[PDB]
A paper describes a structure:
In order to investigate the structural basis of inhibition of PaFPPS by N-BPs, we determined the structure of the enzyme in complex with ibandronate (Bonviva) to 1.85 Å resolution. We note that also in the ibandronate complex the active site is in the open conformation and the lid region is disordered. Three ibandronate molecules were bound in the active site in this subunit. Molecule BFQ1299 is located in site S1, the common binding site for the DMAPP/GPP substrates and N-BP inhibitors in other FPPSs. The hydrophobic tail of this ibandronate molecule extends into the same pocket as the isoprenyl tail of GPP, which is lined by residues Tyr78, Ser79, Leu111, Met153, Val154, Gln157 and Lys180. Like the diphosphate group of GPP (see above), the bisphosphonate group is anchored to the protein via two Mg2+ ions (denoted Mg1294 and Mg1295 in this complex), which in turn are bound to the enzyme by two aspartate residues from motif I: Asp81 and Asp83. A third Mg2+ ion (Mg1300) is bound at the opposite site of the bisphosphonate group and completes the trinuclear metal site seen in FPPS–ligand complexes from other species. However, owing to the absence of the hinge motion, motif II is not close enough to provide ligands to this metal ion. In place of these stabilizing interactions from motif II, Mg1300 together with two additional Mg2+ ions (Mg1301 and Mg1302) provides the anchoring point of two additional ibandronate molecules that are bound at the active site. However, we consider the binding of these additional inhibitor molecules to be a consequence of the open conformation of the enzyme in the crystal lattice rather than a novel, alternative mode of inhibition by N-BPs in PaFPPS.
Farnesyl pyrophosphate synthase (FPPS; EC 2.5.1.10) is a promising antibiotic drug target as it represents the point of convergence of these two pathways. The enzyme belongs to a large group of prenyltransferases responsible for the principal bond-forming reactions of isoprenoid biosynthesis. The mevalonate and nonmevalonate pathways both produce isopentenyl pyrophosphate (IPP), which along with its isomer dimethyl­allyl diphosphate (DMAPP) is converted through a ‘head-to-tail’ condensation reaction to form geranyl diphosphate (GPP) by FPPS. In summary, this work provides the first functional and structural insights into FPPS from the opportunistic pathogen P. aeruginosa.
Numbering used by the authors:
A (entry chain B): 0 to 227, 247 to 291
B (entry chain A): 2 to 163, 168 to 227, 247 to 293
């Protein structure tokens, strides 16, 4: 499809940029940097960089402008996975059939590698060579990423998730959890791409945020459907399917008035379901 | 400078205290862990440095509030992770349960991850850190490079990956030097009066004191400086480091006295 090709292009672009980020400054840091590289260069689909690139092109921006945004979101994503896999959390030996970072290396090294990837995400956005936007915009990007990645966003989601082991969640609570744990970063990816366009305005940003909210949930509902507290458990399988379609429609409706260059976002919304 | 310290401490604690309000109820416990990890009665050396660097260059100290917060937030998150079972495995810090004991291990990992996000948030926030934009960006750049795999986190890995004196110093310069230097650099930037020669002088200062802390702590506890150099020679080196710090400040005006007093204080403990 058009979306499969767009994804492959986004993936190649962000991987080339990311690949350059993992050279140890000196020899004693080689293994730390190898763990960082292992944690990022893992053949991931790069959905968050796709969203950044696509939001940028949806507002008329050349996609290379969003390279730093794309790297930063993926660096936050990657660090999150390394921490999530740790024995204190999900305790997973494998991710996509490969040894998790703490399994490949060791637990200390994985914690640190990921800590350094979070630093690096902020580094790339603050770096005016790598992220050559107007200064006020670089700062806004950093602000939005920090709020999305932190205790009010993604890390908060993780805490909500750990804090409801034992509790039977209803749909509202499930959605609170999801909106933090994954929504915040998906929204930031769209917001930061849009900012990288050089043409953001408040109406277009707010529309793109409605898009991001809808697709972020649509991802979760559809994943649950395909794995068949989950959406099908709550609603039954057919009604979950209906809801996935309702979310796709909300996303497409949010893009009303956008030009043909927003097609990749429209295509993705449909693809998800 | 015990009184200057206590003032820096009260200033930064007031600003930090305001950062730990959970946006909603489901996040209360996370935010409590964050607070517990920061509001721990720490001496706030890094904020003292940021404030004092700012004043050394003629800047009113409140201009450095965000820098002070950011460096302390990085410092605090680093302690939580350093205390974990996979690293130093400490049950206590300053006689109190470590965050992973008071709460739980996942919560401690997460609380600290959110402190690191928050440090960058505070510097990028033009209300809390109201400098010129290019200066905000430069502060963020320097903190990110200092906190990350090329600085502080690198130092942790070097330590775990381990010694002659050169190698000990490589380790220290990453593990603690990078963040001490960033604290001084960020305060200096917050002054609005930074210039390259002064920034370079202040960096020499920070390099010297960072090491002076480590040398003197090893001396007092008697791969340590006394083991490596001999006890009396380590004492000599501590003085040498203090003098390098004071020399780096030669030609700064009287408002740099707090930095001078700290250099002496370190080696007089
Ligand atoms: C540490 C913050 C992570 C926030 C959510 N991540 C996407 C976690 C990764 C997951 O999607 P994954 O299935 O483990 O990949 P989880 O089910 O554990 O939530
Ligand atoms: C080895 C293949 C395992 C399953 C692969 N996907 C389900 C992983 C995607 C995820 O991590 P996510 O939480 O769905 O986004 P999941 O939890 O569904 O697994
Ligand atoms: C990422 C970790 C960087 C932290 C560097 N030090 C401040 C850690 C704390 C120590 O000083 P502490 O004595 O545990 O407080 P350490 O001796 O373990 O280095
Ligand atoms: C295996 C340790 C080699 C690194 C240097 N030290 C001896 C570690 C011990 C410390 O971190 P600790 O706080 O005493 O555990 P120190 O502050 O003495 O450096
Ligand atoms: C780099 C600033 C040093 C400030 C003094 N330290 C807190 C003294 C205590 C130590 O030596 P200790 O291992 O706690 O005894 P640390 O490793 O924490 O530095
Ligand atoms: Mg998980
Ligand atoms: Mg998991
Ligand atoms: Mg999962
Ligand atoms: Mg320790
Ligand atoms: Mg340690
Ligand atoms: Mg200590
Ligand atoms: Mg020491
Ligand atoms: Mg120690
Ligand atoms: Mg010791």
């Amino acid at each position: 499809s058009m979306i499969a090709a767009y994804q492959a292009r986004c993936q190649a672009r962000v991987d080339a940029a990311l690949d350059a980020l993992f050279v140890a400054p000196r020899e004693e840091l080689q293994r730390l940097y190898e763990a960082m590289r292992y944690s990022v260069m893992n053949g991931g689909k790069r959905v968050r960089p796709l969203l950044a690139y696509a939001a940028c092109e949806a507002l008329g921006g050349a996609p290379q402008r969003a390279d730093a945004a794309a790297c930063a979101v993926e660096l936050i994503h990657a660090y999150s996975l390394v921490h999530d896999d740790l024995p204190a959390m999900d305790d997973d030996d494998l991710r996509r059939g490969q040894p998790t970072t703490h399994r490949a290396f060791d637990e200390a090294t994985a914690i640190l590698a990921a800590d350094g990837l979070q630093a690096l995400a902020f580094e790339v956005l603050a770096d005016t060579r790598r992220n050559p936007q107007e200064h006020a915009v670089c700062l806004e990007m950093l602000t939005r990423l920090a709020r999305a990645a932190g205790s009010a966003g993604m890390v908060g989601g993780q805490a909500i998730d750990l804090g409801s082991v034992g509790v039977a969640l209803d749909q509202a609570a499930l959605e609170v959890m999801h909106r933090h744990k994954t929504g915040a970063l998906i929204e930031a990816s769209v917001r930061l791409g849009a900012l990288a366009s050089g043409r953001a305005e408040p109406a277009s940003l707010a529309a793109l945020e409605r898009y991001a909210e809808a697709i972020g949930l649509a991802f979760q509902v559809q994943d649950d459907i395909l794995d068949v507290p989950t959406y099908p458990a709550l609603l039954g399988l057919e009604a979950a399917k209906g809801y996935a379609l309702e979310l796709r429609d909300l996303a497409l409706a949010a893009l009303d008035g956008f030009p043909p260059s927003a097609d990749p976002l429209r295509q993705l919304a449909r693809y998800i379901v």
